Design a protein around this ligand. Structure first.
Ligand SMILES: NC(=O)c1ccc[n+]([C@@H]2O[C@H](COP(=O)([O-])OP(=O)(O)OC[C@H]3O[C@@H](n4cnc5c(N)ncnc54)[C@H](O)[C@@H]3O)[C@@H](O)[C@H]2O)c1
Ligand SMILES: NC(=O)c1ccc[n+]([C@@H]2O[C@H](COP(=O)([O-])OP(=O)(O)OC[C@H]3O[C@@H](n4cnc5c(N)ncnc54)[C@H](O)[C@@H]3O)[C@@H](O)[C@H]2O)c1
Length: 292
């Protein structure tokens, strides 16, 4: 018999850590009712991964069975892939940062609207158990001053982008919790000899709260997050982690599916886009302050 599936055909682009996780999740029962994994695109000659076939980029853009593209490649290639798939009429889910350029991001949102497609930038950091804790903590409190520092191993800027972009998840935490921020200063310390880098950013909330955001990367440095928020009524210097954020990417996919089903209000869609663009704008400005 001839039956037209009501499910959205998905192609995963880039099979690194994120891509592998997306492929795994697309096989989960939580993905069964609305999504159909068609294949994956890779710059390497894999041919297939288990029962999932590799499809050339050219064929993926042409295929009428593909309705959605998950862009999981390195940051520097996101812009190009997003543009090609939107132009081809496919909905797009892309891992943050969607681009390494504010202007480029503006262009892509406009293109998505033009083609009537959903463009979704994944931000699992807002779905973390640790963030739920912070959301409850800041509720009804006035931020006087605070600091958020994240340390980790070296990361190739050429592939993942400038630190403000590669670590935009930390900035997203701050903007989500305290609203739009104004940039006061930004400094970048680079010791390529020791594969070391430290970016220090000073931001200000609309309530005069002063925030310090530091991103540090160096050999041997363990992945650590330091939080210190001082409020007018109470303080916070530690965020517990008792879970492992299981199925966090499926939670993000669930949001994307709600958009595909057109079950997200215009207001919610607008608020999210405004936040995304504000963060990308700040990252872009921070880069200029550090490089110029
Ligand atoms: N055409 C190509 O070269 C090519 C290459 C790759 C993928 N595809 C994909 O294949 C799908 C369709 O083309 P296809 O030929 O490959 O698939 P297909 O025709 O081999 O699919 C077969 C299924 O359709 C049913 N069916 C088809 N015509 C029927 C009829 N008249 N009466 C009763 N049942 C019928 C069969 O019984 C069977 O369940 C699309 O999803 C397309 O993207 C096509
Ligand atoms: N891997 C994740 O958990 C995750 C979460 C959100 C966004 N992303 C984005 O996915 C794309 C590539 O991701 P990948 O992990 O699949 O490729 P990858 O497999 O090439 O990554 C190799 C290494 O880089 C690290 N890494 C990747 N993106 C990073 C980032 N923004 N900041 C700090 N370390 C990072 C990984 O954890 C891993 O140790 C990038 O655009 C990235 O920002 C990845």
């Amino acid at each position: 018999m001839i039956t037209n599936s009501g499910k959205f055909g998905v192609v995963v682009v880039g099979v690194g850590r994120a891509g592998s996780v997306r492929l795994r999740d697309l096989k989960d029962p939580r993905s069964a009712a609305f999504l159909n994994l068609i294949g994956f695109v890779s710059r390497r000659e894999l041919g297939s991964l288990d029962e999932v076939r590799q499809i050339s980029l050219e064929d993926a853009l042409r295929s009428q069975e593909i309705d959605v593209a998950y862009i999981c490649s390195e940051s520097s290639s996101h812009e190009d892939y997003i543009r090609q798939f939107l132009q081809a009429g496919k909905h797009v889910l892309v891992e943050y940062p969607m681009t390494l350029s504010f202007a480029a991001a503006q262009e892509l949102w406009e293109l998505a609207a033009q083609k009537g497609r959903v463009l979704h930038e994944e931000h699992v950091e807002l779905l973390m158990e640790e963030f739920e804790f912070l959301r409850r903590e800041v509720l009804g409190k006035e931020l006087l001053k605070g600091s958020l520092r994240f340390t980790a191993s070296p990361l190739e800027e050429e592939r993942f982008g400038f630190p403000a972009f590669s670590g935009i998840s930390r900035l997203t935490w701050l903007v989500s919790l305290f609203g739009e921020l104004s940039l006061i200063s930004a400094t970048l310390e680079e010791r390529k000899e020791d594969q070391y880098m430290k970016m220090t950013v000073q931001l200000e909330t609309q309530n005069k709260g002063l925030l310090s955001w530091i991103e540090e990367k160096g050999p041997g440095l363990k992945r650590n997050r330091y939080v210190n928020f001082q409020f007018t009524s109470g303080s916070l210097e530690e965020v517990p982690s008792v879970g492992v954020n299981k199925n966090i990417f499926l939670k993000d996919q669930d949001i994307f599916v709600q958009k595909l089903l057109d079950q997200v209000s215009a207001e919610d869609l607008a608020a999210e886009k405004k936040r995304i663009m504000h963060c990308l704008g700040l990252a872009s400005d921070i880069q200029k302050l550090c490089h110029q």
